[PDB]
Design an enzyme around this catalytic site. Structure first.
Site, mmCIF file in Angstrom:
data_model
loop_
_atom_site.group_PDB
_atom_site.id
_atom_site.type_symbol
_atom_site.label_atom_id
_atom_site.label_comp_id
_atom_site.label_asym_id
_atom_site.label_seq_id
_atom_site.Cartn_x
_atom_site.Cartn_y
_atom_site.Cartn_z
ATOM 1 N N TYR A 1 0.669 -1.070 -0.008
ATOM 2 C CA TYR A 1 -0.001 -0.041 -0.001
ATOM 3 C C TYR A 1 0.793 1.215 0.103
ATOM 4 O O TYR A 1 1.608 1.599 0.833
ATOM 5 C CB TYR A 1 -0.731 0.053 1.017
ATOM 6 N N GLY B 1 -5.369 5.233 -0.299
ATOM 7 C CA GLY B 1 -6.712 5.566 -0.317
ATOM 8 C C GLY B 1 -7.661 4.492 -0.953
ATOM 9 O O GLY B 1 -7.180 3.179 -1.268
HETATM 10 O O1 LIG Z 1 -5.252 6.728 5.649
HETATM 11 C C1 LIG Z 1 -4.470 6.151 4.531
HETATM 12 C C2 LIG Z 1 -3.760 5.108 4.728
HETATM 13 O O2 LIG Z 1 -2.411 5.053 4.789
HETATM 14 O O3 LIG Z 1 -4.460 3.828 4.757
HETATM 15 C C3 LIG Z 1 -3.529 7.472 4.131
HETATM 16 O O4 LIG Z 1 -2.276 6.975 3.587
HETATM 17 C C4 LIG Z 1 -4.375 8.075 2.865
HETATM 18 C C5 LIG Z 1 -3.447 9.065 2.274
HETATM 19 C C6 LIG Z 1 -4.135 9.923 1.039
HETATM 20 C C7 LIG Z 1 -5.485 9.671 0.549
HETATM 21 F F1 LIG Z 1 -5.779 10.338 -0.184
HETATM 22 C C8 LIG Z 1 -6.132 8.683 1.310
HETATM 23 C C9 LIG Z 1 -5.642 8.009 2.520
#
Ligand SMILES: *O[C@H](C(=O)O)[C@@H](O)c1ccc(F)cc1
Lengths: 525, 525, 525
Positions: free
Chosen positions: C52, C59
């Site tokens: 991720y 996200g």
């Molecule tokens: O909470 C998110 C995660 O790390 O799971 C975060 O990284 C995130 C950053 C930018 C976004 F647009 C959504 C989520």
């Protein structure tokens, strides 16, 4: 039998007395300490020296000096003039908790009350004589406790079938002679936090069980939609972010989903995703989600924060239960202590915090419901869990609304511990409103059971529609069967209110926490 | 008989139907308009063309096209699947108001329902068949209205002695055959603001009466403590600050205190003060107050602001009652209107405002109570209105607490109209939560009656202790006698809860507004 | 120097770095562990394995797989696209606390970031390069942190003399070459709770100092009005009601008033009153109050409750400061952890609780000001502390208003931890809003310094008007002197605002706490 010694009473014990009607016993050691305090105290009062509420007027009228010849009248006038509670009456279990809290306070031995007062309160609890206590009046708990005190002198009312019955008649019947209030006994009975502490104990104990039942349905849901187990790995909590509550939720989630054939391990997801990727494309779409939405991944963090709050509140309540929340106080070989241990700020704060935490617990549950009913988020499930022809049938579409509406309603409940309003000629210029705080928490607790009810029904329905029952873990199968014991699968649309209320009632009595106890070897934190 | 024509219904009429059980009649002209709309509409539906909720699924599932051959099932499945309300059931009068609101909406003629639906709703009201409506579920009013709709098809429950009874049985008994829901009738019955509008009507009408009863006790109090009449002079309002509500409160106050021998004119105060002053002193103390505290002088401004808010809300409710809050809508010679007239934002806002205004009305009343019980502020009255020996007796000291506590509790009630939470696959991404707003207002209204109850008791007691009855105006003597008819003067301290509840109940049924009507020639605004 | 090791950082240490510009040092062991994690992690990312935010979109767009050849652009687009903060910019000390919190998080070693990231962050702190961080945008802390990360790659803005200046020239202006974000570095820098945790540390640390400074002026006031010492006796707390905070406040109060010649012991008050009562009559009036009002009596209970809340928050914050609040996370020998340790619920709740606790602290402080200004309540003090002719002069009458107004304002601040709103295609369906909670607490803390400033000025004025300086305890004299060094006695009426702001600033600096430590042998808890 529960030991009410003003020293070791726990929130759990309070609930046993209040809900389970467990017998109460004031140990001989507590009786001896009380008798000794009373005897020495009487000698002091007998000398007609200034003692708040014993040889003086009350509150602002402390400037009025009252002779010891008015002993019984002073105490009696107080209880009568302060029995001014209004609104609904507390239920039998709530009233019992309040009485038990007051009994424990006096059992500590610093209130200088005659042992008979302890014996009588104990008798009312053991014989089922329940005071009719109006919920409104306390500034944080004179009014509510004054109604309790009234029943000891054959006045006021006692609760019978949810109806108030004249205490005099009840005592005449049960063959009991009303007591007479001696030096300091009227005041000692009403000058404390027993209202908010007794009710707060029930709420907090139940809130912890609600936290557990939220984890239980969350686990079933995760299995139904085949979520990842990665978020619950011990390393991410025990090591990476050691918040106590967070550690406990993760541990419970791991135990609950143990043995599931539906959950997927991170190793499996990334592998399934690596194969789905082809190699000449720098950026490519996939229908595989390596991680799930917050509502199915941030459970340890959110429910854990809720737990931390509940742990703090229970700790405060335990301290309060075994404290001498009364005034003035007797300490052998010392002047009579004139302070403010009747001030419920510590508990008012605690309960306002519980209200906030529980609101978020419901926010999470409600979004999890949204997750399974929304075809764009459910991960393969039919829209709104319709088993037949959607459109013609709405399935669980209408059932989501009461859950959504309750989240909004809980959000309209503001903190009470900060809303002090000066009264009594400015003598009580700073109060805690703690009983309001406790009633706010009870309300969110109650609303959450309706929210969870819809979630348990949606989860079981999801299992039915996906035909994933045989893949469920032992705990999940148990949770599923518990629900199905009350309410059938949703074939064609049908009136939902009775179904929702039935499961909501089951949740309120901890039926799902019981199912796991009874059907699995799991011991939830 | 009240005419339900979807055009001229007033909040007062709604209350007559709901509270007074006044007969309802749908005029022939409204029936003719409905019949014509239905007939033309049926011809359209008969052609199997796309019409929301008639030949399509509901909410998000509008993408599902349903054939006209499923007419009755579509409408029936909706009502069943959406009857998911939870919590307490509305009282009989509240349920009647909701039904009446729905009847008026359909009577307007743009809902394309069969006249029989109007006739049946009218019959339930006229025959006393009251639906059991759960209070929680509406996002702003599907759930509540679905329970009402259920009773029309012999399903759901009807209220009997505060208990829900199976509708089927009630209809079989009363000799009535359930209806069948034809094109659009299930949806038309539940797709509106009748829940919040019906309940809001009761609350607003009662709130205006509460504003009047606050002015009534305020006038008595002012006379008891011999306040100045200067603050109520017409010039200061009609000319200087012409807010409508402010003008009305001042006019009422002048009328209420007309004929008093206790009130003092500004001319008299300044003269009494000029004589008390001596002439070689540049700065000198006096026990004479040329002006009284805000709680006895800013009445037109505060209660007036409350009135302005109530006037605005009643205006909105009147509009809403006589609106076609339904969807879709029929307009002859036009395409079927597909909008959102079911959205209760206008009323959700209105009721949240009423909650705020009423909270302040209670804040004022509570501070007026503080004024007469505090010897430092009462102006000659004994501390806490104790008639005997203070200290030994507390008088009204304990009675102030429930009033103070209720001000704090009302302050914990936050706005609901802003708490929208998206649901139904994001189709309902912006809702009003208006029924929650209406229930919040009802709660403050109810709490205020307890606050005023304590004020009416304190005022009468003040009259007794000061021996100022013969100096009271005609309205004041009437107010005093009204109170004393229920509760006696406070000699020695005594249990207060029953006394407070008795007067609170009298206030809720407008007994003091009645006393003035009956005993004086005063016509309050 | 302050050691940022991701294991032992304290709230105090954060403030030293942020407020006192203390030098930071990331221990060699931390750098080594980071290095080790980075090496192993890089080996995995090189395999183009699904991770991720490293080889996938962010996200909701996690369904998008990104090839390792897009390493730098992926991290960069993220930081840029999320630098969407709005509203005012954080102060330099606040910005520093946030950077320190993030650095400590990465120093734990589970973020798999290159050591250079840790080094550059520490460099920015040590060289005084403060990022320009707008306060709004975090859902609980992407936006705030993205602005920080921007400055590391020479983008966004740096804070100079309160104004934002391009990072590009600031870095050039001091020989620093911006960095290039590699695998996971952009995400690790912005994916956590450092905004709310950094600010929360400052607020909670300062909140504890505010409790102490509240206790300090309270003690002075109690001496000035000759209050009783009975309420603070150890037995009443250490024994009767063992709440930690209550015990601490009581201990502090006893120490602050130790050596006072103005305070009265219960024994003396009791005898004094005995001497004032005549024989025969069973009810007589007296001007002596055996007990003082709550605002002077339940200090241990109220401030103690505030302390308990503050201790709990500090505990949460210390845990959070030394946690791996980032995602995904690396653990040697284990699959990459994909959870939600970036979720700020534990901190959002904590700060919401602080907001409530501090609001009540100000409520108490304000009622104490009311006590001393009101002739009917203050012991031996003229109305509104007017030195000369009252009426002609108002004294502190006008200064009470801003304090009263601030209590009302703080009460309009509601909890944020429960206001989650779903976003990002419902991926972030449950958030904490913790930075809003943190800013709410900061606001109340700031407002309390003004309320307290008025109390400090009023306390000093009371000492002068009563001529009780010589009777003051050592600590009381030091407090008085500290106030007088800043503001002179109030003779004739004068512009008040500058005096209030002066004392308020001193309070925010902790000047009075420093006065007690520098002038007495007291050590406050
Ligand atoms: O909470 C998110 C995660 O790390 O799971 C975060 O990284 C995130 C950053 C930018 C976004 F647009 C959504 C989520």
């Amino acid at each position: 039998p529960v030991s009410v010694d003003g020293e070791t009473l726990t929130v759990e014990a309070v609930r046993r007395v209040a809900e389970e009607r467990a017998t109460v016993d004031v140990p001989a050691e507590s009786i001896a300490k009380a008798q000794k305090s009373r005897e020495i105290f009487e000698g002091i009062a007998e000398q007609n020296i200034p003692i708040y509420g014993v040889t003086t007027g009350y509150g602002e009228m402390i400037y009025m000096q009252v002779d010891k010849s008015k002993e019984v009248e002073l105490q009696t006038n107080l209880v009568r003039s302060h029995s001014a509670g209004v609104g609904p009456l507390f239920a039998e279990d709530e009233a019992r908790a309040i009485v038990a809290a007051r009994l424990n306070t006096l059992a500590k031995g610093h209130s200088a009350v005659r042992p008979i007062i302890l014996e009588r309160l104990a008798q009312y609890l053991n014989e089922g004589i329940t005071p009719a206590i109006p919920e409104i009046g306390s500034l944080g708990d004179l009014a509510p406790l004054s109604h309790v005190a009234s029943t000891l002198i054959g006045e006021g009312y006692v609760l019978r079938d949810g109806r108030p019955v004249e205490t005099a008649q009840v005592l005449a019947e049960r063959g009991i002679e009303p007591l007479e209030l001696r030096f300091k006994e009227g005041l000692a009975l009403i000058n404390g936090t027993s209202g908010m502490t007794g009710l707060g104990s029930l709420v907090v104990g139940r809130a912890l069980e609600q936290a557990q039942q939220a984890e239980i349905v969350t686990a079933l849901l995760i299995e139904a939609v085949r979520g990842s187990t990665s978020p619950f790995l011990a390393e991410g909590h025990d090591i990476a972010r050691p918040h106590e509550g967070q550690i406990d939720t993760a541990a419970n989630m791991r135990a609950l989903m143990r043995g599931s054939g539906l959950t997927v391990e991170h190793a499996d997801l990334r592998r399934e995703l690596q194969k789905d990727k082809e190699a000449g494309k720098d950026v490519q779409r996939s229908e595989i989600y390596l991680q799930k939405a917050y509502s199915l991944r941030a459970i340890p963090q959110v429910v854990g924060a809720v737990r931390d709050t509940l742990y703090h509140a229970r700790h405060k309540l335990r301290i309060e239960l075994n404290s001498a929340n009364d005034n003035p106080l007797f300490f052998e070989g010392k002047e009579i202590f004139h302070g403010a241990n009747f001030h419920g700020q510590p508990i008012a704060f605690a309960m306002d915090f519980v209200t906030i935490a529980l609101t978020q617990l419901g926010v999470l549950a409600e979004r999890q419901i949204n997750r399974v009913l929304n075809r764009h988020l459910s991960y393969g499930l039919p829209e709104f869990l319709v088993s037949g022809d959607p459109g013609l049938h709405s399935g669980f579409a209408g059932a989501q609304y009461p859950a959504t509406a309750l989240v909004a309603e809980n959000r309209t409940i503001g903190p009470a511990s900060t809303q002090s309003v000066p009264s009594n000629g400015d003598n009580q210029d700073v109060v805690s409103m703690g009983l309001i705080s406790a009633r706010n928490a009870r309300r969110v607790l109650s609303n959450n059971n309706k929210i969870l009810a819809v979630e348990y029904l949606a989860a079981a329905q999801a299992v039915d529609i996906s035909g994933r029952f045989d893949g469920l873990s032992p705990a999940a199968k148990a949770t599923y069967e518990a629900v199905r014991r009350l309410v059938p699968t949703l074939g064609v649309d049908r009136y939902m209110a009775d179904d929702i209320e039935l499961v909501a009632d089951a949740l309120s009595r901890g039926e799902f926490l019981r199912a796991i106890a009874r059907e699995t070897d799991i011991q939830l934190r």
